[PDB]
Structures are given as structure tokens and as C-alpha cells.
């Protein structure tokens, strides 16, 4: 039984959430923000990512060089990432360097220069990032997957934004973005590891007290996405490995089917030919794929957003003449979530997940990420006892009902990259979403 997550608020509406671990010597403190690229329109798309660069370019007090030195002197590091719905800025340090790190984070978020000279400098760095993501195949595949599934909608936009916007982002629109979005009621200060909650609350009162509150304070993790069945083919015969993602519209964080969808995902599971144990996994798809050498890997996912999600699988394969078999057998295993699954598969997947949801949190950064994610999506940290009860409530017959309304005979979003000549047209893929025998 892990120590209890303590939670306090400030007057502005900033949440402070902490989980202490007296066995470790480091601490991850940071700011989780319920805001990301999805909050941009088409004209300022890329702003959130642009700001992440300039946050480390110097403040009203410390210059870029002074900033570098201050963190070097602390001994730990700072890190940041911007997603579609979430922005994170954290600092890993020593136990007694926590007041320094909170002070630096408060500075870069509230009091950043955003000097025209630095905007102009980063504008090239970010332009170069557009031509180097091209190598990260998984990211290419998932960005096209969002673009097509949420065609012409805010969730469909990339985080980097178009080339055109990068050239036209001003300090004015940067300032406007962070003033509108980085408000106290949307922010959570998180501490995990060697942190005292009461000390962290005092540091929040000292540094984050003059944060703006939004005009209309909605609860944390408050949002209509209209999924498009569609495909993107990025054929490249010179690549040796095909990368394919297939997804349906999945579930939001607060869906009643959230846990049902996780169990369904665990029934298919993951596979990697490079891992020794993968040939012996219980998953039927794993067995088919390994015995027939159909793939190098597959990874089931159930990605959630505030008001929608994507549920599907990501495949990589060198077997270019049997892509058809790989996709065929994958979708036939999904069909069985509707037609065939019983207590045998469901109880097995529940066993595996009851541990998996706890295992994931193995370092202070993972714990902080868990507290921060849950507070910004659900408005609260869900205790392991509650999670164990929600998993236990999932029956085989919940899974069947969920798959019958979510997967069975449904439109898919499909992205193929690489030597995908063997990937059949949309209809033949989508025809495998049902079984004529059932």
C-alpha cells in the first residue's frame, strides 16, 4: 500500500498534489497544465510547442546563460513536453534542491522574456524539426493517424504546426496563448519522491500566487470530435519495414467504458520478436504472429482524450508479402472480442492489468506523471483500491457489449508507411471488421 496522495489548493485555484517516498533521495516537482496544441486555432497552430522552446531562452531576471548555469548548479535537470491536451514542465533534483527548482519553474512560466531575437533564432530550429521527425516512423504514423481520424478538427492538428505558422508566430500571439491557457485553475503543481507536502504548498504560495485565474473556471479535465473512417498511405518501397496503424474511435478519460476498453486492449496485448518471452505469450494474436513470422512487433493502444479516444494497434513488419495475412489475422482477433470472448480471456487480462497499472509507476518521474495526468484529466488521483474495484467490475459480457458497439463492423482509420503494396484497399480491410459466419 503506497502512501496517500495529499492535495491542497491555493486561493487562485492552483492545485498542489504530492506523494512522498522516504526511501528515495531525489524529487520530481513540476507543473501539469490542462492545455496543449488542441487549444490553438488553425492560424496559431504550433504556438504551444513554440513556447516550450522559448521557456528555456531566458526570463526577466536570468538570461539564457544564467538559466543554464542555475540548473547546472542545482545538479538535476529540467524537462518539458507539449501534447494535444496536456503540457508538462518538471524538474528532477536532490531532496534539498526542491525550493530552487520550484523557483526556476515559476520563473520560466510566468516571467519569460519572449524576445524577438530569440523568436527569430528558434524559428529556424523548429523549421529543421519538421524535416527530422520524418525519421521517427512511429511518430509519423501516429501523427497521420490523428490527422485523418479527426479530419479538419483540432485533435487532427500536429503539435509542431505547419511551416507557414512557424514563420509567422509573434511574441504577441505567444503571450496571448500562455495568458489565456496557463491559468491557475488549469494547473497542478506536483511533487513526488523526497518532498514534504506542507513545504511544497508554501513554495506554491511564494511563487505561484500571482497566477491569473480564468474568467469561467471549469473543473480539471473538461473538454465535438466526429471520427472519420479513412486511410493515409505513405508508400515507400525503399524502406525495409512497413509501419501500419489501425484504430477505431475509442473512449475518453471519464468514459464508463474506460476500463472495459483497457481490458479489451490487454486481450490482444503486445508482441516483439526481440523479446525472449514474446513467443510464449497467451494472446491468440501473439501466437499467430510469432508462429507465422508475420511481424517484428505489434502494440495495442487505447489513447484517451477529454471527449474521445483512439483504440487500435500499431504493427511493424518486414514480411512484405504477408501484410495481408497480418492485417487479416489482427482484425479477426478483434472480431472475437465481439463474438467469442468469455471469462477465460477476460479474467486473464484483468489479472495482468491489476498489476500492470501499479508496475508502471516505478520512479519519482513516473509517479509525478501519474499524479499530474490523473489530476488534469479526472480532477482527482484515483486510489489503487478504486482502480482494483473498477477492473474487477469488468465482466466478459461488458467486453462483448463494448466490442459490439465500438469495434464490430465499424469504420477504421488506417495509416500505412513503407513497403505497403501488400496492404489491400480500404474496403477489404474494413470488411475484416465483421465475420460473415457470425
Amino acid at each position: 500500500v503506497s502512501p496517500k496522495t495529499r492535495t491542497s489548493n491555493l486561493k487562485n485555484g492552483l492545485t498542489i498534489a504530492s506523494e512522498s517516498n522516504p526511501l528515495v533521495q531525489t524529487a520530481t516537482v513540476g507543473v501539469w497544465i490542462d492545455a496543449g496544441s488542441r487549444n490553438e486555432n488553425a492560424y496559431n497552430n504550433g504556438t504551444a510547442h513554440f513556447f516550450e522552446h522559448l521557456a528555456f531562452k531566458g526570463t526577466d531576471k536570468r538570461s539564457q546563460h544564467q538559466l543554464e548555469l542555475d540548473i547546472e548548479n542545482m545538479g538535476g535537470h529540467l524537462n518539458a513536453y507539449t501534447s494535444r491536451e496536456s503540457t508538462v514542465y518538471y524538474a528532477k533534483s536532490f531532496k534539498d534542491d526542491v525550493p530552487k527548482s520550484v523557483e526556476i519553474l515559476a520563473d520560466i512560466l510566468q516571467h519569460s522574456k519572449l524576445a524577438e531575437s530569440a523568436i527569430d533564432r528558434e524559428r529556424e530550429v523548429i523549421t529543421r524539426e519538421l524535416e527530422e521527425v520524418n525519421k521517427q516512423y512511429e511518430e509519423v504514423v501516429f501523427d497521420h493517424l490523428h490527422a485523418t481520424a479527426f479530419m479538419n478538427q483540432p485533435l487532427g492538428r500536429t503539435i509542431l504546426g505547419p511551416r507557414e505558422n512557424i514563420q509567422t508566430i509573434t511574441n504577441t500571439e505567444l503571450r496571448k496563448f500562455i495568458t489565456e491557457n496557463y491559468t491557475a485553475d488549469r494547473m497542478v503543481l506536483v511533487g513526488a519522491g523526497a518532498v514534504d507536502h506542507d513545504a511544497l504548498v508554501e513554495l506554491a504560495e511564494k511563487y505561484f500566487s500571482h497566477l491569473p485565474s480564468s474568467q469561467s473556471p471549469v473543473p480539471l479535465g473538461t473538454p465535438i470530435p466526429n471520427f472519420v473512417g479513412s486511410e493515409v498511405r505513405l508508400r515507400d518501397d525503399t524502406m525495409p519495414v512497413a509501419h501500419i496503424a489501425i484504430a477505431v474511435e475509442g473512449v475518453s478519460w471519464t468514459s464508463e467504458d474506460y476500463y472495459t476498453a483497457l481490458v479489451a486492449q490487454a486481450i490482444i496485448g503486445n508482441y516483439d520478436r526481440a523479446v525472449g518471452t514474446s513467443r510464449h505469450q497467451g494472446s491468440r494474436l501473439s501466437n499467430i504472429v510469432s508462429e507465422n513470422n508475420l511481424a517484428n512487433s505489434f502494440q495495442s493502444f487505447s489513447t484517451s482524450y477529454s471527449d474521445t479516444g483512439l483504440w487500435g494497434i500499431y504493427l511493424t513488419s518486414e514480411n512484405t508479402t504477408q501484410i495481408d495475412d497480418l492485417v487479416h489475422f489482427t482484425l479477426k482477433e478483434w472480431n472475437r472480442l465481439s463474438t467469442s470472448v468469455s471469462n477465460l480471456q477476460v479474467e486473464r487480462a484483468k489479472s495482468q492489468l491489476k498489476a500492470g497499472l501499479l508496475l508502471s509507476l516505478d520512479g519519482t518521474t513516473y509517479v509525478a506523471e501519474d499524479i499530474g495526468r490523473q489530476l488534469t484529466t479526472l480532477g482527482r488521483r484515483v486510489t489503487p483500491a478504486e482502480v482494483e474495484a473498477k477492473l474487477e467490475a469488468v465482466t466478459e459480457h461488458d467486453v462483448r457489449a463494448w466490442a459490439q458497439k465500438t469495434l464490430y463492423d465499424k469504420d477504421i482509420a488506417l495509416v500505412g508507411l513503407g513497403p505497403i503494396e501488400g496492404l489491400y484497399d480500404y474496403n477489404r480491410i474494413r470488411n475484416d471488421m465483421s465475420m460473415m459466419r457470425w
Binding site: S230, R233, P419
Partner: protein, 85 residues
């Protein structure tokens, strides 16, 4: 000159992104009225001469031959028929 799926015999393909949408997501008869009128008119107009010229020539030839044959086997065509045989 033809392989099979995965090795069809295409030159290497690169740089083309292809997009489409589900049959359930699309209106199958989108723009049908425009196509039925304007597209068909364009399509037909561009091919009209290749049908009209040979059809009209061979129909004219037939018409002349059949009319002559008919006339040759009347009373009036007696003399011309006698020469023709």
C-alpha cells in the same frame, strides 16, 4: 510482366501520399447531377465525330445502294436492270 501483392513489378514508389474516406462516410451519389449532365456532355462531345463520320458515311452508302436496287426492280428500271445484268 506482372508479379503479385508485395512484388507487383512497379518501379520503386516514393513520395506519394494517398488519402481516401470510408464508403460509409461518403455520399456515393455526391455530384451525380452535375456529372450526369456536364461530364457526360463533355465526354460525348469529344467523341462525337468518331462515331458520326463513319456511321453517316456507311448509312449514306447503304441508302443509295438500297434505293437503286429498289428502283432497278420496278417497271421504270427495266432497261437499266437489263444492262446491270
Amino acid at each position: 510482366y506482372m508479379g503479385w501483392w508485395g512484388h507487383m513489378g512497379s518501379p520503386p514508389q516514393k513520395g506519394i501520399a494517398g488519402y481516401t474516406i470510408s464508403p460509409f462516410a461518403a455520399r456515393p451519389f455526391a455530384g451525380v447531377v452535375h456529372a450526369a449532365i456536364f461530364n457526360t456532355f463533355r465526354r460525348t462531345k469529344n467523341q462525337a465525330l468518331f462515331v458520326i463520320l463513319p456511321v453517316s458515311f456507311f448509312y449514306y452508302v447503304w441508302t443509295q445502294a438500297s434505293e437503286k436496287n429498289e428502283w432497278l426492280y420496278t417497271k421504270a428500271g427495266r432497261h437499266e436492270l437489263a444492262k446491270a445484268l
